[PDB]
């Protein structure tokens, strides 16, 4: 819409109050003109037709419980845009400020959220397994990171390249959650998963095996479900990335941590420069070693920790 840029206020899924960028033109719309070509949030009104209607509001105050998922989708797409711009100097997901669009209230009781190739889509959850999925900054950033991967490496969504795809999304979802310093941790989806149970999450990067995902290449899943285990085998890479950052000893192999910032620089370089659509885990290791080499030198501690972490999870 063409209108005047303004600032409205509302409450997110978890009850927290936040200011959001809106546009006025008769109604106030969830349209943020301050970032790139804009961030636009739509109401899918419980249907599966997309994108639905651009979210319009009569008074620029978004405190209704139906508003909550929209506030957070719109706000956390902004934080994710800011992370990539400020940290990695990337303008939006295509590198050229493409507009970011998200639809909330997709379908009824839908327990998922996803990047569909053109925009973000968020279900409201059934209220038992999940609450509206846009309330999780690591979910939002995880899904927006699929758009980055689609425009750069192009990792196909199956077997080892799909598992890399998924792990890259977990890593950057987690780095965005630390960037916003939103009670940060190495788990995925803990703010919106099972409102009735405290302490659990969807996946764990620090200990993937807590939920039954593999933490070593010898335990990888080799069947056909989940497109060859893309959500299951991503645990092997997530555990490597946690070790590079935080350090630790894993199946007897010791890794000195180099921290989150360098972890993000190494993987972002590897994703945008060396990975290709059919990369598998062994070429991810070569790509990460080459990236750390480019950045810190072949005799650095950063290269040595990248090699130790992949050796610890059995990836040669």
The residues binding Ca ion (CB under 5 A) are: 57, 59, 61, 138, 183, 185, 187, 193-194, 197, 200
3-state helix, strand, coil in the chain (%, to 5): 40, 20, 40
User: How many residues touch a second copy (CB under 8 A)?
Assistant: 22
Concerning whether 160 is annotated as a catalytic residue, the answer is: no
C-alpha 155/C-alpha 278 separation (Å) is 6
Residue 151's binding partner among a second copy, Zn ion, Ca ion, none (Cβ under 5 to 8 angstroms by kind) is a second copy
- 278 touches a second copy by CB under 8 A: yes
Please report, for residues 25, 44, 80, 202, the alpha-carbon distance to residue 99 in angstroms, rounded to integers and kept in the order given. Answer: 19, 18, 13, 29
Q: Which stretch binds a second copy (CB under 8 A): 12-20, 43-51, 131-139, 304-312?
A: 43-51
Active site residue 216: no
Q: Which is nearer to Ca ion, 89 or 183 (CB)?
A: 183
- Cis check: omega of the bond before 51, within 30 degrees of 0: yes
* Residue from 6, 16, 19, 47 in contact with a second copy (CB under 8 A): 47
d(CA 127, CA 101): 24
Q: Which residues share a beta bridge with 248?
A: 255
213 versus 302: smaller Cβ distance to Ca ion: 213
Cβ–Cβ < 8 Å for 266, 250:
no
Yes or no: say if 126 and 111 are a contact pair by the CB < 8 Å rule: yes
Neighbours of 10 (CB within 10 A): 24
Q: Which stretch of DSSP H or E encloses residue 42?
A: strand 39-43
- Asked if residue 169 binds Zn ion (CB under 5 A), the reply is yes
Pick out residues in 116-175 that bind a second copy (CB under 8 A).
116-118, 121, 150-151, 154, 156-157
Binding site partner of 297, from a second copy, Zn ion, Ca ion, none, Cβ cut-off 5-8 A by kind? none
Residue ranges at the known binding site: 57, 59, 61, 138, 142, 146, 166, 177, 183, 185, 187, 190, 193-194, 197, 200
Residue ranges at the known binding site for Zn(2+): 142, 146, 166
Active site residues: 143, 231
């Amino acid at each position: 819409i063409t209108g005047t840029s303004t600032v409205g206020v509302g409450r997110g899924v978890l009850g927290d109050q936040k200011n959001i960028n809106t546009t006025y033109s008769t109604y106030y719309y969830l349209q943020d003109n301050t970032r790139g070509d804009g961030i636009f949030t739509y109401d899918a009104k419980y249907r599966t037709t997309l994108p639905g209607s651009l979210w319009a509001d009569a008074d620029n105050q978004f405190f209704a419980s139906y508003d909550a998922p929209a506030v957070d989708a719109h706000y956390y797409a902004g934080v994710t845009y800011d992370y990539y711009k400020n940290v990695h100097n990337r303008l939006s997901y295509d590198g050229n400020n493409a507009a970011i669009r998200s639809s909330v209230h997709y379908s009824q009781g839908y327990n998922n959220a996803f990047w569909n190739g053109s925009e973000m889509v968020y279900g409201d959850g059934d209220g038992q397994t999940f609450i509206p999925l846009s309330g999780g900054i690591d979910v939002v950033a995880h899904e927006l990171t699929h758009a980055v991967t689609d425009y750069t490496a192009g990792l196909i969504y199956q077997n080892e390249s799909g598992a890399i795809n998924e792990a890259i999304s977990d890593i950057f979802g987690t780095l965005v959650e630390f960037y916003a310093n939103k009670n940060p941790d190495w788990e995925i989806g803990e703010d919106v998963y099972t409102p009735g149970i405290s302490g659990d999450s969807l996946r764990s990067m620090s200990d993937p095996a807590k939920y039954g995902d593999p933490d070593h290449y010898s335990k990888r899943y080799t069947g056909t479900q989940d497109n060859g285990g893309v959500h299951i085998n991503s645990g092997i890479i997530n555990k490597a990335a946690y070790l590079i950052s935080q350090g630790g000893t894993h199946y007897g192999v010791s890794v000195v941590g180099i921290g989150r910032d360098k972890l993000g620089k190494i993987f972002y370089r590897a994703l945008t420069q060396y990975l290709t659509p059919t990369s598998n885990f062994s070429q991810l290791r070569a790509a990460a070693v080459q990236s750390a080499t480019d950045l810190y030198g072949s005799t650095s501690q950063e290269v040595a920790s990248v090699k130790q972490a992949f050796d610890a999870v059995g990836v040669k």
